Design an enzyme around this catalytic site. Structure first.
Site, PDB file in Angstrom:
ATOM      1  CB  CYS A   1      39.840  39.582  28.650  1.00 21.25           C
ATOM      2  SG  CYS A   1      40.449  38.162  29.952  1.00 21.25           S
TER       3      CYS A   1
ATOM      4  CB  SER B   1      43.263  36.322  28.825  1.00 24.81           C
ATOM      5  OG  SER B   1      42.994  35.756  30.048  1.00 24.81           O
TER       6      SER B   1
ATOM      7  CG  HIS C   1      47.834  37.069  30.658  1.00 24.15           C
ATOM      8  ND1 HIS C   1      48.201  38.026  31.634  1.00 24.15           N
ATOM      9  CD2 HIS C   1      46.945  36.287  31.473  1.00 24.15           C
ATOM     10  CE1 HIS C   1      47.904  37.687  32.882  1.00 24.15           C
ATOM     11  NE2 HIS C   1      47.058  36.790  32.820  1.00 24.15           N
TER      12      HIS C   1
ATOM     13  CG  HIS D   1      39.597  36.108  24.665  1.00 28.12           C
ATOM     14  ND1 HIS D   1      40.692  37.110  25.015  1.00 28.12           N
ATOM     15  CD2 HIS D   1      39.082  35.926  25.984  1.00 28.12           C
ATOM     16  CE1 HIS D   1      40.603  37.062  26.367  1.00 28.12           C
ATOM     17  NE2 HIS D   1      39.732  36.514  26.815  1.00 28.12           N
TER      18      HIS D   1
ATOM     19  CB  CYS E   1      36.013  36.185  28.384  1.00 28.51           C
ATOM     20  SG  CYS E   1      37.110  35.583  29.587  1.00 28.51           S
TER      21      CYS E   1
HETATM   22  N1  LIG Z   1      39.890  30.782  33.455  1.00 30.23           N
HETATM   23  C1  LIG Z   1      39.549  31.472  32.668  1.00 30.23           C
HETATM   24  O1  LIG Z   1      38.826  30.997  31.738  1.00 30.23           O
HETATM   25  C2  LIG Z   1      39.822  32.778  32.663  1.00 30.23           C
HETATM   26  C3  LIG Z   1      38.749  33.760  31.982  1.00 30.23           C
HETATM   27  C4  LIG Z   1      39.180  35.055  32.159  1.00 30.23           C
HETATM   28  C5  LIG Z   1      40.009  35.716  32.806  1.00 30.23           C
HETATM   29  N2  LIG Z   1      41.352  34.664  33.209  1.00 30.23           N
HETATM   30  C6  LIG Z   1      42.220  34.999  33.920  1.00 30.23           C
HETATM   31  O2  LIG Z   1      41.811  35.540  35.179  1.00 30.23           O
HETATM   32  C7  LIG Z   1      42.601  36.502  35.960  1.00 30.23           C
HETATM   33  C8  LIG Z   1      41.834  37.774  36.191  1.00 30.23           C
HETATM   34  O3  LIG Z   1      41.619  38.623  35.184  1.00 30.23           O
HETATM   35  P1  LIG Z   1      40.997  39.827  34.957  1.00 30.23           P
HETATM   36  O4  LIG Z   1      39.864  39.922  36.127  1.00 30.23           O
HETATM   37  O5  LIG Z   1      40.612  40.307  33.833  1.00 30.23           O
HETATM   38  O6  LIG Z   1      42.271  40.633  35.455  1.00 30.23           O
HETATM   39  P2  LIG Z   1      42.401  42.084  36.178  1.00 30.23           P
HETATM   40  O7  LIG Z   1      41.128  43.015  35.985  1.00 30.23           O
HETATM   41  O8  LIG Z   1      43.949  42.509  36.030  1.00 30.23           O
HETATM   42  O9  LIG Z   1      42.311  41.789  37.586  1.00 30.23           O
HETATM   43  C9  LIG Z   1      43.269  41.365  38.432  1.00 30.23           C
HETATM   44  C10 LIG Z   1      43.191  41.776  40.059  1.00 30.23           C
HETATM   45  O10 LIG Z   1      44.368  41.153  40.824  1.00 30.23           O
HETATM   46  C11 LIG Z   1      44.761  42.183  41.536  1.00 30.23           C
HETATM   47  N3  LIG Z   1      46.110  41.676  42.026  1.00 30.23           N
HETATM   48  C12 LIG Z   1      47.325  41.421  41.343  1.00 30.23           C
HETATM   49  N4  LIG Z   1      48.308  40.952  42.282  1.00 30.23           N
HETATM   50  C13 LIG Z   1      47.721  40.752  43.433  1.00 30.23           C
HETATM   51  C14 LIG Z   1      48.110  40.082  44.629  1.00 30.23           C
HETATM   52  N5  LIG Z   1      49.376  39.746  44.744  1.00 30.23           N
HETATM   53  N6  LIG Z   1      47.199  39.710  45.587  1.00 30.23           N
HETATM   54  C15 LIG Z   1      45.846  40.260  45.206  1.00 30.23           C
HETATM   55  N7  LIG Z   1      45.450  40.805  44.377  1.00 30.23           N
HETATM   56  C16 LIG Z   1      46.458  41.153  43.363  1.00 30.23           C
HETATM   57  C17 LIG Z   1      44.882  43.567  41.073  1.00 30.23           C
HETATM   58  O11 LIG Z   1      45.058  44.475  41.598  1.00 30.23           O
HETATM   59  C18 LIG Z   1      43.483  43.298  39.933  1.00 30.23           C
HETATM   60  O12 LIG Z   1      42.430  44.004  40.845  1.00 30.23           O
HETATM   61  C19 LIG Z   1      43.895  36.640  34.785  1.00 30.23           C
HETATM   62  O13 LIG Z   1      44.973  36.056  34.847  1.00 30.23           O
HETATM   63  C20 LIG Z   1      43.202  36.127  33.474  1.00 30.23           C
HETATM   64  O14 LIG Z   1      44.133  35.776  32.385  1.00 30.23           O
HETATM   65  C21 LIG Z   1      40.930  33.356  33.297  1.00 30.23           C
HETATM   66  O1  LIG Z   2      40.399  34.811  29.566  1.00 32.81           O
HETATM   67  C1  LIG Z   2      40.482  33.586  28.852  1.00 32.81           C
HETATM   68  C2  LIG Z   2      41.518  32.757  28.729  1.00 32.81           C
HETATM   69  C3  LIG Z   2      42.004  31.939  29.365  1.00 32.81           C
HETATM   70  F1  LIG Z   2      41.226  31.208  30.560  1.00 32.81           F
HETATM   71  C4  LIG Z   2      43.330  31.015  29.163  1.00 32.81           C
HETATM   72  F2  LIG Z   2      43.778  30.216  29.934  1.00 32.81           F
HETATM   73  C5  LIG Z   2      44.067  31.407  27.973  1.00 32.81           C
HETATM   74  F3  LIG Z   2      45.017  30.771  27.631  1.00 32.81           F
HETATM   75  C6  LIG Z   2      43.653  32.569  27.171  1.00 32.81           C
HETATM   76  F4  LIG Z   2      44.423  32.947  26.107  1.00 32.81           F
HETATM   77  C7  LIG Z   2      42.316  33.066  27.685  1.00 32.81           C
HETATM   78  F5  LIG Z   2      42.066  34.083  26.726  1.00 32.81           F
HETATM   79 ZN   LIG Z   3      39.414  36.428  29.087  1.00 32.61          ZN
END
Ligand SMILES: NC(=O)c1ccc[n+]([C@@H]2O[C@H](COP(=O)([O-])OP(=O)([O-])OC[C@H]3O[C@@H](n4cnc5c(N)[nH+]cnc54)[C@H](O)[C@@H]3O)[C@@H](O)[C@H]2O)c1
Ligand SMILES: OCc1c(F)c(F)c(F)c(F)c1F
Ligand SMILES: [Zn+2]
Ligand SMILES: NC(=O)c1ccc[n+]([C@@H]2O[C@H](COP(=O)([O-])OP(=O)([O-])OC[C@H]3O[C@@H](n4cnc5c(N)[nH+]cnc54)[C@H](O)[C@@H]3O)[C@@H](O)[C@H]2O)c1
Ligand SMILES: OCc1c(F)c(F)c(F)c(F)c1F
Ligand SMILES: [Zn+2]
Ligand SMILES: [Zn+2]
Ligand SMILES: [Zn+2]
Lengths: 374, 374
Positions: free
Chosen positions: A46, A48, A51, A67, A174
């Site tokens: 993921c 995250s 990050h 996770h 996730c």
């Molecule tokens: N809220 C939650 O519970 C939760 C859970 C899972 C993931 N996340 C977050 O969600 C986000 C996406 O996760 P992912 O799908 O695993 O990431 P990922 O697979 O990197 O996807 C991100 C996408 O965003 C695109 N991107 C980057 N910059 C831009 C831009 N400026 N404009 C348009 N597109 C852009 C990039 O090309 C990629 O396809 C991350 O920040 C994770 O940490 C949050």
């Molecule tokens: O992708 C899930 C996810 C989140 F949405 C968070 F806000 C975070 F802090 C983290 F560590 C995480 F794994």
């Molecule tokens: Zn996640």
């Protein structure tokens, strides 16, 4: 038997930020009361987890990250009632203690026992079950799935269908549930609506799946990487746009496309600027925008509150708003019942020892989800 | 015998920012097609009117302000079907055209014909009905109620009960409907919940009324003017806090008092800092915060989007989310049935000619609503 004994096993240890994971032997302590030790089968990569490596997310180091996973219960501590040795399980990075005000609230899922807000990188008891080269190693979100064995608190694990394919349903830990829930439960996307989804990785594709499932008429995918468009269309996007293709800000393009703003928008990247853009492209009087992406530590956005005064709704969620222990086994059941697909999210399947190569596939834009198999 | 003729009457003209209003003769053109000329009976002094004077709210000058009012139709233009001469009416600062995508949406009220987002200070046809000293004078929000007579577009006026007391029901044209709707319709306050209300003027008192109507267990008034507390309690605050009494920021104080954050919070002041504080003070996972106050022109707030990611919902609204033309007559009907009180908001009564003293009262902190009578 391993029950009641220290297990020596392989894990991917992150010793410091912006370095490759170190694949090496760790010692996993047996579970204490109300704890569960799990033999890992599959774990997803993921964003995250990336990050943590990049320092976008601050959590104590050294750490065993991971996770999004599934495995099989090796042993249980005294007092555990909800799983047993041999059970298939998914660790819950958002716990469900069942007793806090949030757990008791009908909408709330961000349980007060979580280790996300003020991370300690421990078990619920403030201690660690992991050592490596004599040193204690932190846990990550109560899960630490980048290990052949982890120990979790009972409130951070769900029992799932015995017949589940763990190399697919790990995504319910996730990426899938987060995107899907963000559309169906948090946003409550409506039939015939117009949706915009910023970020077409594993999470954003899952938002698309949820928007399609909810009966959206139009689902506009937004990404700077046009390689992500074909899969987004396969899972339901009606049209994709690359902000880099336009002379105007993409909020303006989206507002014109949608004849005055979208019904629902989703930020699924983790950038302050796209969170504001996503808000702005929803219709000013009744639009809803959901933040899903994780932004860099401690940074504030700037916005004009008139965006809200006109009527917009802005919200965010962890884990798609799902109460984690109630929802995860239901979601697996629904997958087994063919109610949604997970294969479109999976682009790469590597052995666990190739964790670094998995992260390089992500960082290069080439993968959606890589599933690592133990 | 005034029908079809220019009317000369007194109005309160604002020629320049940060100056008193000038009570002086204006000429009021007769209504054009789908316009309505109204003899004003009573108008309230709302803080948004004061914002035009201070430059908090930018709208073209010179202007006839005033938006919270009631009167009697003097004449109608061609094609008007919804009111007639002699009808009691409330001008609608948020119009309801009934045809736009917002008007057709079940939850939208910020009709696309509004003059709030990018104020022109005209009628719908881009021109003015007002002359003063031979110079055209702008309209304000399509209402311009600080005049013995005004002309409004038909979509900016509602017929109300012929037996209505206009010196009370004018508050339904802004302050009361706004605060009450913000609680009952926008926030959807629930029975047994804990609310915090920032700003205890006419609008925040109306929010309290709404929260008490919706069955909230606790309603905490927040004001730096402790003189506002007694009335807030009379209308349902269970406790009042002054931020200046505390060493800690008030969001922390409110979080403690509410054992982990409130269910609903309302910003009813118009400051960027209190918009952020109000969001912060609602429970992180399931709290809802509603922005009601009008911010200073073109200024941006700064906030940490993790406040949303945990699960908070942030929204804003104009006129309590009410569709204006549908709602105003129903609100008047309910007032006449004693479903809510308006007297607690009225602290002062003055003749229209004493409009400046009315503004002094608001500015000093002494009044809630002053009602001006023509
Ligand atoms: N809220 C939650 O519970 C939760 C859970 C899972 C993931 N996340 C977050 O969600 C986000 C996406 O996760 P992912 O799908 O695993 O990431 P990922 O697979 O990197 O996807 C991100 C996408 O965003 C695109 N991107 C980057 N910059 C831009 C831009 N400026 N404009 C348009 N597109 C852009 C990039 O090309 C990629 O396809 C991350 O920040 C994770 O940490 C949050
Ligand atoms: O992708 C899930 C996810 C989140 F949405 C968070 F806000 C975070 F802090 C983290 F560590 C995480 F794994
Ligand atoms: Zn996640
Ligand atoms: N959204 C809408 O449709 C709408 C409608 C009507 C009024 N408004 C706005 O709502 C706000 C309230 O209007 P009103 O009730 O007529 O105003 P008002 O009578 O000035 O009340 C504002 C209250 O806020 C208090 N206050 C000022 N600073 C602070 C502070 N830092 N902390 C706590 N309290 C403070 C102040 O003492 C006063 O009692 C103004 O910004 C209006 O322009 C919005
Ligand atoms: O008080 C109601 C009211 C508002 F909510 C505004 F946003 C605004 F711009 C304005 F002029 C107004 F009068
Ligand atoms: Zn809990
Ligand atoms: Zn309309
Ligand atoms: Zn007002």
């Amino acid at each position: 038997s391993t029950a009641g004994k220290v297990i020596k096993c392989k894990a991917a240890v992150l010793w410091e930020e912006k370095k490759p994971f170190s694949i090496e032997e760790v010692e996993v302590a047996p579970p204490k009361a109300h704890e569960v030790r799990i033999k890992m089968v599959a774990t997803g990569i993921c964003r995250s987890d990336d990050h943590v490596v990049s320092g976008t997310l601050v959590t104590p180091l050294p750490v065993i990250a991971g996770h999004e996973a599934a495995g099989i219960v090796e042993s249980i501590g005294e007092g555990v009632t909800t799983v047993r040795p041999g059970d298939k399980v998914i660790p819950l990075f958002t716990p469900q203690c069942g007793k806090c005000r949030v757990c008791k609230h009908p909408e709330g899922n961000f349980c007060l026992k979580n280790d996300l807000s003020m991370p300690r990188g421990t078990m619920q008891d403030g201690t660690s079950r992991f050592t490596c080269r004599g040193k204690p190693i932190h846990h990550f979100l109560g899960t630490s799935t980048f290990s052949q064995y982890t120990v979790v608190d009972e409130i951070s694990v769900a029992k799932i269908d015995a017949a589940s394919p763990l190399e697919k349903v790990c995504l319910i830990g996730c990426g899938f549930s987060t995107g899907y829930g963000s559309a169906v439960k948090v946003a409550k996307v409506t039939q015939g609506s117009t949706c915009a989804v910023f970020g077409l990785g594993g999470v954003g594709l899952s938002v698309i799946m949820g928007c399609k499932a909810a009966g959206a008429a139009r689902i506009v995918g937004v990404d700077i990487n046009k390689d992500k468009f074909a899969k987004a269309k396969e899972v339901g996007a009606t049209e994709c746009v690359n902000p880099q293709d336009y002379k105007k800000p993409i909020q303006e393009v989206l507002t014109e496309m949608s004849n005055g703003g979208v019904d629902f928008s989703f930020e699924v990247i983790g950038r302050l600027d796209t969170m504001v853009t996503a808000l702005s492209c929803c219709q000013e009087a009744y639009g809803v925008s959901v933040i899903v992406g994780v932004p860099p530590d401690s940074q504030n956005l700037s916005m004009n509150p008139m965006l809200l005064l006109s009527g917009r709704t802005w919200k965010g969620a962890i884990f798609g708003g799902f109460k984690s222990k109630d929802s995860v086994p239901k979601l697996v059941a629904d997958f087994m019942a063919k109610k949604f697909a997970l294969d479109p999210l999976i682009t790469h399947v590597l052995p666990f020892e190739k964790i670094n190569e998995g992260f390089d596939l992500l960082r290069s834009g080439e993968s959606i989800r890589t599933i690592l198999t133990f």
